[PDB]
Design an enzyme around this catalytic site. Structure first.
Site, PDB file in Angstrom:
ATOM      1  CB  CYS A   1      13.357 103.928   4.463  1.00 16.57           C
ATOM      2  SG  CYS A   1      13.780 105.666   4.187  1.00 16.57           S
TER       3      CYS A   1
ATOM      4  CG  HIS B   1       7.536 109.512   1.119  1.00 17.29           C
ATOM      5  ND1 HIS B   1       6.677 109.680   2.178  1.00 17.29           N
ATOM      6  CD2 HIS B   1       8.691 110.149   1.466  1.00 17.29           C
ATOM      7  CE1 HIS B   1       7.277 110.407   3.111  1.00 17.29           C
ATOM      8  NE2 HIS B   1       8.508 110.670   2.713  1.00 17.29           N
TER       9      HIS B   1
ATOM     10  CB  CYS C   1      18.529 104.289   3.651  1.00 17.02           C
ATOM     11  SG  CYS C   1      17.854 105.924   3.320  1.00 17.02           S
TER      12      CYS C   1
ATOM     13  CG  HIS D   1      15.590 102.865  -0.270  1.00 15.83           C
ATOM     14  ND1 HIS D   1      14.267 102.911   0.096  1.00 15.83           N
ATOM     15  CD2 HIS D   1      16.218 103.824   0.455  1.00 15.83           C
ATOM     16  CE1 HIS D   1      14.102 103.836   1.022  1.00 15.83           C
ATOM     17  NE2 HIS D   1      15.278 104.398   1.264  1.00 15.83           N
TER      18      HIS D   1
HETATM   19  C1  LIG Z   1      12.969 112.588   7.243  1.00 14.97           C
HETATM   20  C2  LIG Z   1      13.846 111.540   6.632  1.00 14.97           C
HETATM   21  C3  LIG Z   1      15.334 111.960   6.746  1.00 14.97           C
HETATM   22  C4  LIG Z   1      13.564 110.240   7.386  1.00 14.97           C
HETATM   23  O1  LIG Z   1      13.944 110.452   8.740  1.00 14.97           O
HETATM   24  P1  LIG Z   1      13.347 109.502   9.913  1.00 14.97           P
HETATM   25  O2  LIG Z   1      13.273 108.079   9.376  1.00 14.97           O
HETATM   26  O3  LIG Z   1      14.157 109.719  11.150  1.00 14.97           O
HETATM   27  O4  LIG Z   1      11.906 110.132   9.998  1.00 14.97           O
HETATM   28  P2  LIG Z   1      10.757 109.972  11.049  1.00 14.97           P
HETATM   29  O5  LIG Z   1       9.429 110.377  10.431  1.00 14.97           O
HETATM   30  O6  LIG Z   1      10.811 108.588  11.656  1.00 14.97           O
HETATM   31  O7  LIG Z   1      11.123 110.968  12.221  1.00 14.97           O
HETATM   32  C5  LIG Z   1      10.760 112.324  12.215  1.00 14.97           C
HETATM   33  C6  LIG Z   1      10.674 112.938  13.578  1.00 14.97           C
HETATM   34  O8  LIG Z   1      10.219 114.302  13.405  1.00 14.97           O
HETATM   35  C7  LIG Z   1       9.459 114.591  14.522  1.00 14.97           C
HETATM   36  N1  LIG Z   1       8.670 115.762  14.242  1.00 14.97           N
HETATM   37  C8  LIG Z   1       7.506 115.869  13.510  1.00 14.97           C
HETATM   38  N2  LIG Z   1       7.050 117.148  13.523  1.00 14.97           N
HETATM   39  C9  LIG Z   1       7.962 117.852  14.265  1.00 14.97           C
HETATM   40  C10 LIG Z   1       8.162 119.241  14.710  1.00 14.97           C
HETATM   41  N3  LIG Z   1       7.228 120.133  14.360  1.00 14.97           N
HETATM   42  N4  LIG Z   1       9.222 119.590  15.503  1.00 14.97           N
HETATM   43  C11 LIG Z   1      10.143 118.646  15.825  1.00 14.97           C
HETATM   44  N5  LIG Z   1      10.042 117.336  15.471  1.00 14.97           N
HETATM   45  C12 LIG Z   1       8.981 116.925  14.737  1.00 14.97           C
HETATM   46  C13 LIG Z   1       8.617 113.325  14.752  1.00 14.97           C
HETATM   47  O9  LIG Z   1       8.027 113.246  16.047  1.00 14.97           O
HETATM   48  C14 LIG Z   1       9.622 112.261  14.471  1.00 14.97           C
HETATM   49  O10 LIG Z   1      10.234 111.749  15.664  1.00 14.97           O
HETATM   50  C15 LIG Z   1      13.553 111.164   5.161  1.00 14.97           C
HETATM   51  O11 LIG Z   1      12.206 110.748   5.030  1.00 14.97           O
HETATM   52  C16 LIG Z   1      13.770 112.291   4.187  1.00 14.97           C
HETATM   53  O12 LIG Z   1      12.925 113.199   4.085  1.00 14.97           O
HETATM   54  N6  LIG Z   1      14.867 112.161   3.436  1.00 14.97           N
HETATM   55  C17 LIG Z   1      15.200 113.106   2.361  1.00 14.97           C
HETATM   56  C18 LIG Z   1      16.246 112.566   1.427  1.00 14.97           C
HETATM   57  C19 LIG Z   1      15.721 111.418   0.608  1.00 14.97           C
HETATM   58  O13 LIG Z   1      14.629 111.476   0.105  1.00 14.97           O
HETATM   59  N7  LIG Z   1      16.595 110.461   0.412  1.00 14.97           N
HETATM   60  C20 LIG Z   1      16.309 109.281  -0.404  1.00 14.97           C
HETATM   61  C21 LIG Z   1      16.416 107.978   0.396  1.00 14.97           C
HETATM   62  S1  LIG Z   1      15.333 107.933   1.874  1.00 14.97           S
HETATM   63 ZN   LIG Z   2      15.669 105.808   2.744  1.00 16.94          ZN
END
Ligand SMILES: CC(C)(COP(=O)(O)OP(=O)(O)OC[C@H]1O[C@@H](n2cnc3c(N)ncnc32)[C@H](O)[C@@H]1O)[C@@H](O)C(=O)NCCC(=O)NCCS
Ligand SMILES: [Zn+2]
Ligand SMILES: CC(C)(COP(=O)(O)OP(=O)(O)OC[C@H]1O[C@@H](n2cnc3c(N)ncnc32)[C@H](O)[C@@H]1O)[C@@H](O)C(=O)NCCC(=O)NCCS
Ligand SMILES: [Zn+2]
Ligand SMILES: [Zn+2]
Ligand SMILES: [Zn+2]
Lengths: 374, 374
Positions: free
Chosen positions: A46, A51, A174, A67
């Site tokens: 994840c 991070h 997660c 996790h």
């Molecule tokens: C973002 C979270 C939910 C992870 O989500 P995910 O795995 O789906 O992220 P990922 O980076 O793969 O996907 C993000 C998507 O955003 C898109 N994106 C990027 N910039 C932009 C934009 N300007 N407009 C639209 N989409 C965008 C990307 O193309 C991508 O497809 C996670 O990292 C987070 O921030 N969680 C917060 C809560 C937390 O910390 N919990 C603890 C356990 S993780």
């Molecule tokens: Zn996570």
């Protein structure tokens, strides 16, 4: 054979920020009272794990991260009552102590025994169960799943269906639950509604699945990467929009598409500058905007509070708002009954020892989710 | 009878920003179809009326301001069905058309026919019923209550109990309902909860009344003017704190007082730099913070979205979240049934022609509410 004794196994240790993981021989101590030692079967990679590497999620190093995972209980410490040796389990990075003011609250889930707010990198008792060449290694979020065996507190593990395919249901730990619950638990998306989902990674795809399960009439996927659209539509999106394709701001485009604003918007990106867009596109009197993703080293955003004064609600949650130990077994039972699919989220499967390759897939944007198998 | 004819009367016209009100002889046209002409009996002086004078609530000038009032119907236009001549009525600065997507929504009350978002200062038909020596004068919020007679659209008036005391129930037209509904309707304060109220003016006092009605165990008033504390405690505050007395930021003080954050917090000040304090003092996993007050010339505030990711909810509303035409009669019925008191909110009473002295009382902080009587 192994109960009550130290286990020597392999783990992925992060010795320092901004370095690759090192596959090390580690010693895993036996569980103390109210602790559970788990043989890992599968673990997802994840963004929060990355991070840690980047040093933007600050937690003590050296560390065994990981996790999102599933495994089988190897042994239990004194006083454990909720799992037994042989049981399939999912570690809970958000615990459920059942006793704090949050666990007792009907709507809270961010249990006060969590190690996410102010990470200490230990078991609940303030100590570690891991050493490497004699050196203590920290835990991560009470889980530490990048190891062949881990030890967790009882409040951070749930028993799941004995017939579960662990290499799929690890996502319930997660990413799937985070996105699915954002829709079904936090927002409580309603039948016939219009939803906007900002970000179409695995968590945003899970948000879509939840909106679809809730009977949304329209689910608008938003992503700058058009390669993400096909899978979005496969799992439920009715339409997809790329902000880069439009000559006006996407909040204006979405308000026009939805005849004055959407019912529910979800912010599922690790970026700040998209959050107020997501809020503003929901209907000004009754719209609800949920924050699911945030950047790790998160600065302040700028917003006008008149966006809320008209009647909007803005909220967020960890882990989809689910009380973790009550919910995870129920989510697994739903998966077993084919109420939702996890296969669309899993783009890559690698052996554990290829963990660095899995992170490189994450960083390049090529993967939705890579699952590591032990 | 004056029905069907122009009425010559007195009104307080604001000819230009940053000037006193002028008591003028005006001509009030008879109501057209679906319009209602009202003889004013009492009108409150609210902060929003003074923002019109300051030029910070932008609405076309010259104008008859005033939006919190009660009167008696003088006549009805063709097609009116919900009030009759002789009825006691409260004009509604937030209309209820009953037809728009908001009116139809269970949770929405900021009807799209409102003249608050982009004020035009007319009747629904785009015209004015007021002239002052032949010069047209603008309406304000579809109400214009600083006049011995006004004309309003039927969707902007509610019939109330024939026996109600107009010099008290005029508060239901803005300040009381705004604060009371913020607690009982928007936040839905629960029995045994701990609430924090930022701002102990008339609206903050009405918030307190709603929290007490809801069964809150602790209600913490916060104001920089300690002269506001005694009345706060009279209407239900359990304690009052002045931020000027403390070295630490008040969110930290309140989090300590409440053993880890309050259940509900209310932001009831026309200031930006207190809003994030109010959000941060609610419990990080399940706390709710409601925006009631904002500065009119409202810029962007700086906030960290991590405050919401833990599980906090941030929301706002106009007019306490009440669908206005449905709710005002029921609020007056509650008052007549002794379910709440309004006398604690009324600190000064003046004849209408002393309107400028009433604004002096508001500007100095001396009053809670002045009521003008005709
Ligand atoms: C973002 C979270 C939910 C992870 O989500 P995910 O795995 O789906 O992220 P990922 O980076 O793969 O996907 C993000 C998507 O955003 C898109 N994106 C990027 N910039 C932009 C934009 N300007 N407009 C639209 N989409 C965008 C990307 O193309 C991508 O497809 C996670 O990292 C987070 O921030 N969680 C917060 C809560 C937390 O910390 N919990 C603890 C356990 S993780
Ligand atoms: Zn996570
Ligand atoms: C502020 C609102 C709710 C009016 O509230 P009210 O009449 O109670 O306001 P009033 O100025 O009398 O009281 C505010 C109180 O805040 C206190 N205060 C000022 N600064 C601070 C501070 N830093 N900390 C705590 N209290 C403060 C003042 O001492 C005062 O007692 C209103 O002006 C508003 O912003 N409404 C927004 C919605 C709207 O525009 N509706 C349209 C119809 S009004
Ligand atoms: Zn707990
Ligand atoms: Zn309407
Ligand atoms: Zn007002």
């Amino acid at each position: 054979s192994t109960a009550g004794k130290v286990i020597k196994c392999k783990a992925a240790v992060l010795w320092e920020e901004k370095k690759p993981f090192s596959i090390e021989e580690v010693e895993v101590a036996p569980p103390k009272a109210h602790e559970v030692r788990i043989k890992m079967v599968a673990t997802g990679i994840c963004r929060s794990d990355d991070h840690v590497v980047s040093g933007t999620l600050v937690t003590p190093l050296p560390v065994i991260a990981g996790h999102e995972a599933a495994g089988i209980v190897e042994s239990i410490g004194e006083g454990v009552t909720t799992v037994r040796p042989g049981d399939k389990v999912i570690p809970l990075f958000t615990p459920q102590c059942g006793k704090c003011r949050v666990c007792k609250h009907p709507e809270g889930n961010f249990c006060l025994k969590n190690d996410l707010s102010m990470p200490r990198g230990t078991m609940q008792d303030g100590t570690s169960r891991f050493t490497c060449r004699g050196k203590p290694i920290h835990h991560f979020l009470g889980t530490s799943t990048f190891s062949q065996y881990t030890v967790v507190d009882e409040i951070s593990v749930a028993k799941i269906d004995a017939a579960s395919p662990l290499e799929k249901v690890c996502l319930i730990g997660c990413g799937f639950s985070t996105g699915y619950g954002s829709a079904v638990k936090v927002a409580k998306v309603t039948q016939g509604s219009t939803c906007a989902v900002f970000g179409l990674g695995g968590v945003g795809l899970s948000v879509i699945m939840g909106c679809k399960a809730a009977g949304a009439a329209r689910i608008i996927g938003v992503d700058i990467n058009k390669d993400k659209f096909a899978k979005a539509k496969e799992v439920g999106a009715t339409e997809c929009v790329n902000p880069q394709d439009y000559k006006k701001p996407i909040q204006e485009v979405l308000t026009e598409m939805s005849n004055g604003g959407v019912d529910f918007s979800f912010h599922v990106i690790g970026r700040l500058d998209t959050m107020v867009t997501a809020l503003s596109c929901c209907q000004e009197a009754y719209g609800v905007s949920v924050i699911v993703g945030v950047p790790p080293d998160s600065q302040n955003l700028s917003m006008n509070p008149m966006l809320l004064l008209s009647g909007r609600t803005w909220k967020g949650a960890i882990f989809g708002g689910f009380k973790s130990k009550d919910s995870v077994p129920k989510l697994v039972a739903d998966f077993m009954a084919k109420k939702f699919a996890l296969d669309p989220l899993i783009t890559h499967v690698l052996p554990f020892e290829k963990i660095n390759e899995g992170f490189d897939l994450l960083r390049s944007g090529e993967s939705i989710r890579t699952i590591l198998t032990f």
